[PDB]
Amino acid sequence: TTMRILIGLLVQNPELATLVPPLENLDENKLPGLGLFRELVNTCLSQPGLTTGQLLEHYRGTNNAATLEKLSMWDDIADKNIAEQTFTDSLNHMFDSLLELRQEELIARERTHGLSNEECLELWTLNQELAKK
Amino acid sequence: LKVPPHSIEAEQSVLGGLMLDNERWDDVAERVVADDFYTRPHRHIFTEMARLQESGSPIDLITLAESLERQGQLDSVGGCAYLAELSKNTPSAANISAYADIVRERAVVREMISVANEIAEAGFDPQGRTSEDLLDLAESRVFKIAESRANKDEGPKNIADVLDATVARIEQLFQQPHDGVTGVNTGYDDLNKKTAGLQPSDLIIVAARPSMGKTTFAMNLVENAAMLQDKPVLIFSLEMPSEQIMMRSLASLSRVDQTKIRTGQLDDEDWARISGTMGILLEKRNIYIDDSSGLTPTEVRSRARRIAREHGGIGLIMIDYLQLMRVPALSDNRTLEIAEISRSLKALAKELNVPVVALSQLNRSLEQRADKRPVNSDLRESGSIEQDADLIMFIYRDEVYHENSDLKGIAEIIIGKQRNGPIGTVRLTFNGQWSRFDNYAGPQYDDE
Amino acid sequence: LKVPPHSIEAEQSVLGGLMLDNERWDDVAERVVADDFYTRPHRHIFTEMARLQESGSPIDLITLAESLERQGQLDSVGGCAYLAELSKNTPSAANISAYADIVRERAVVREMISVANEIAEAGFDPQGRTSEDLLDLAESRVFKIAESRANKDEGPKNIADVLDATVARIEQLFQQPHDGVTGVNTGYDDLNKKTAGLQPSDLIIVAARPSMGKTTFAMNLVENAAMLQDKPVLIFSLEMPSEQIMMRSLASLSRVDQTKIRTGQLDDEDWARISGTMGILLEKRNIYIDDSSGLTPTEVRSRARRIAREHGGIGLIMIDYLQLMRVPALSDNRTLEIAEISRSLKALAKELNVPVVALSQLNRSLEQRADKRPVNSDLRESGSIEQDADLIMFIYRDEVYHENSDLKGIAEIIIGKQRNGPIGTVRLTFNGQWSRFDNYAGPQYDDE
DNA sequence: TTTTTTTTTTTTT
Ligand SMILES: Nc1ncnc2c1ncn2[C@@H]1O[C@H](COP(=O)(O)OP(=O)(O)O)[C@@H](O)[C@H]1O
Numbered sequence A: 001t002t003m004r005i006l007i008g009l010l011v012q013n014p015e016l017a018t019l020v021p022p023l024e025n026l027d028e029n030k031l032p033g034l035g036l037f038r039e040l041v042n043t044c045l046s047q048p049g050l051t052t053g054q055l056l057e058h059y060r061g062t063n064n065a066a067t068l069e070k071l072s073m074w075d076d077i078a079d080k081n082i083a084e085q086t087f088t089d090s091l092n093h094m095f096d097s098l099l100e101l102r103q104e105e106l107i108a109r110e111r112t113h114g115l116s117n118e119e120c121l122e123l124w125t126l127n128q129e130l131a132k133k
Numbered sequence B, C: 001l002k003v004p005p006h007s008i009e010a011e012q013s014v015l016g017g018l019m020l021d022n023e024r025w026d027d028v029a030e031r032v033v034a035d036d037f038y039t040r041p042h043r044h045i046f047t048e049m050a051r052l053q054e055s056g057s058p059i060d061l062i063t064l065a066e067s068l069e070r071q072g073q074l075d076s077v078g079g080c081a082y083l084a085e086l087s088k089n090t091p092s093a094a095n096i097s098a099y100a101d102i103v104r105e106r107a108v109v110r111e112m113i114s115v116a117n118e119i120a121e122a123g124f125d126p127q128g129r130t131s132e133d134l135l136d137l138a139e140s141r142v143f144k145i146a147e148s149r150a151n152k153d154e155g156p157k158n159i160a161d162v163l164d165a166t167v168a169r170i171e172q173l174f175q176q177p178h179d180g181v182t183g184v185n186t187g188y189d190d191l192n193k194k195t196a197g198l199q200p201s202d203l204i205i206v207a208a209r210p211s212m213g214k215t216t217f218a219m220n221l222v223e224n225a226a227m228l229q230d231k232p233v234l235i236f237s238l239e240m241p242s243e244q245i246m247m248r249s250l251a252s253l254s255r256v257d258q259t260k261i262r263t264g265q266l267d268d269e270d271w272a273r274i275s276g277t278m279g280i281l282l283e284k285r286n287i288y289i290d291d292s293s294g295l296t297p298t299e300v301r302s303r304a305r306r307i308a309r310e311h312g313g314i315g316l317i318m319i320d321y322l323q324l325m326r327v328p329a330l331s332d333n334r335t336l337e338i339a340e341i342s343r344s345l346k347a348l349a350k351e352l353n354v355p356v357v358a359l360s361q362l363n364r365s366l367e368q369r370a371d372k373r374p375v376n377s378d379l380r381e382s383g384s385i386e387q388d389a390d391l392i393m394f395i396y397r398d399e400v401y402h403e404n405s406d407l408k409g410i411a412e413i414i415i416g417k418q419r420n421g422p423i424g425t426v427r428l429t430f431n432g433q434w435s436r437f438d439n440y441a442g443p444q445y446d447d448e
Numbered sequence D: 001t002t003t004t005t006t007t008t009t010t011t012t013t
């Protein structure tokens, strides 16, 4: 899935959490496991420059630490630039996923009580951006 | 139940990656094939996209779905929904190389496991197959895997890689105080001047008229190669028994006329001189010999490999002579038989990185010409012999042909062909009584 | 549950033979060792005998029981009762050679199975080992099995052995020839050297073009074997009546021009010779000849077994010839029909432990080539004839194809395959008038 | 899978 790579990259590469844009704006219910995803970024922001051990130390006693270590062992990448690029691609995947969800909500709005010219172009423009990426 | 090795996640990565990107196709086609996929649905999908790519058409969900539908494999793989999920799952095609290598590794181990099962089944139930049959079958299966794995990076290397390898070799040669003679010393300084020793991976050919100088000269090369080196030298005497050539060699190293040696007289005055030479040979243990009349290229390759992987590399190989080797399959045509033998000998030299000396006979067309000096075209059952040879030496003695000759006892080696180096002639004195060739210390002529 | 292959009877028979005869313990020890068995107690017993031989004490029931009792192994091996039973199973100590070979064969098969099991273990759980490690491990194991066999004809002879053989044979030759033969006599001394006689359990083959002495040669072998032994010999003449076969034998043994016998234009001297021959044959009375036509592998087995049981074994079996037998079940694919026939004969040969001589024809492609000497690929409908054969002899007579050839009345026996010993050419004199072959007493040209 | 008979092109002695 898309989540396992994301968490695996983050645990293996704690320095990636610094360059993560905020996620609290969108509800975490949309994507499973996204609630802790922003929390890890918040922990990194509160304590910039932390090793993987420090990141795992904060949640040594948590019940989700097993998944973090398991994904860390999985898909081990020696290259760091590739990991950064992959995380960017994975993060880019989430951004359009949020846009797709917004498009779906707009489509439901369309099928509920139609659309007007302003609503049509708004959803229509949103589709182009989603299609472009 | 032991699940056969495979990585579905790795596979789902490459199919999804190839979905997103078409340019990286060659990056995966060189690494994996349809069969290597563990699941039949993946095999069918790989086959379908290969047909799509070979047609010069783009790869996309519509095309792949359409292609599978025409061939009826759309439902067998899962249908349109299954393909859509595969495309969506893969984030990007950046890491498709490692995934492909992993898939190839899984397939190879899967093949190895099946081979292990296959060999085990045969052992349990010989079904009339002898232990040799099982030994041969296992050896073939191991070889087939080894050769399949052999071609990994065989491709059009760029010049930058080629240049770096070459300059390293040149610097190696320059540093080593070889001072000429990069290969095995021939023992004759004049010959080494033009040849610089017998280079590795070469196919040297010594040719002459019947009973002219062939086995005498070739044995001298073998003796010198053994004396001036520390690597075993192999001899294939398909024409005459090992007892006779050893006797000839003992005379050559002792400089005592054969005469009595053939009869078997251990005369004290001479036996003292030869005494010690057997001691020198015994301590060195540098020479291996196998007449085994009527060999085939495969048998020669098998025996050579065993010697190489037992004492460590080879120093030289001698064949006496080329025309006596037989290829069972290509028996109807003699021309093709010689081409197969010549090509095989060149391959063996490359494989073991050791000079290979082969002897050949000439044609009767030589006598017709006024000037009875051999040329490349005089080889017998020839044509393919002179294409693959890296160095060709003809043994000529004008004394035999013209009794009124100035070359009395002075043989001359004519370098008919040399791929890397000049050609010419070198004069050597011929000691028939001792069956030996010696450096021409007398007034030497100059090549035209 | 697959039980590893073994041979309990061979183990028991070998142990008993060793207990009876001690001078042959060295031969058994060299061929097989203690670890070559399948049952641990038998391995313990073999260790006991090896220890006794190292100390030099005689090996027998009393000594074996004493050593086992002192070491506490007497109860492990079932006590002295089983020690006596081990010899009771063994018929004689002379036949220990075959049983030891079976034990070695089972040991090799067991080792192969273990190596195959190890290969599967490593592949199933890589533990991190790279494919190279697995391949290198597999290659090393295969070489161990292939090389841990001893035997002979396994490679090129080195120098030290060659020099000793050269000097040793030179010294012996000028004093005496010292011919060994030491084989199941075929009657021709020159042929015993290259074959060591007709070894039991083999499947010998004789092939040649029509009217080349194929039946003449086989009959000579049958006659010579009959005189030089006491076991009965059997003949299956599917082509010629018993009368014609007997007429040739009378001409051959008595050295009388067979044209006179056929036409009845004999005289008193010839009648005297024939009468002498008939007296000798009736004195022995150990040749059985069947002229039934179109037999089947079942029929020959039933008849051969019946003759053996009535008179206690067969010393030789001759069939004339292979392609004439019939298998109604597989009466659509000739290739499969011949394959079944050849397999059945080999099974019968080992089942009775008696050499089986079968004749065969050759294709017409031989006559197309410039060199008309047969090769193993010329056997007619040779689906599996070459595979099952343990020894193949071809009969050639250059006088047939060349009136002016200097080899008038000279027949060459070309050995195209053999389990032990070399392969070469044996010359003989062919006296067609008497339907006989004779030793080539003339100048023994060196074979190239 | 094997044995048979007909064409046409090459290479060698
Ligand atoms: N009186 C004779 N003089 C000369 N040659 C003979 C005489 N009798 C038989 N032969 C030869 O002996 C050969 C034996 O042939 P045969 O063994 O029947 O052939 P095949 O190898 O098919 O069994 C024949 O080719 C025949 O020419």
Ligand code: ALF
Pocket: C209, C210, C211, C214, C215, C239
């Ligand atoms: F004469 Al034949 F086989 F050809 F016995």
Ligand SMILES: [Mg+2]
Pocket: C214, C215, C216, C239, C320
């Ligand atoms: Mg016959």
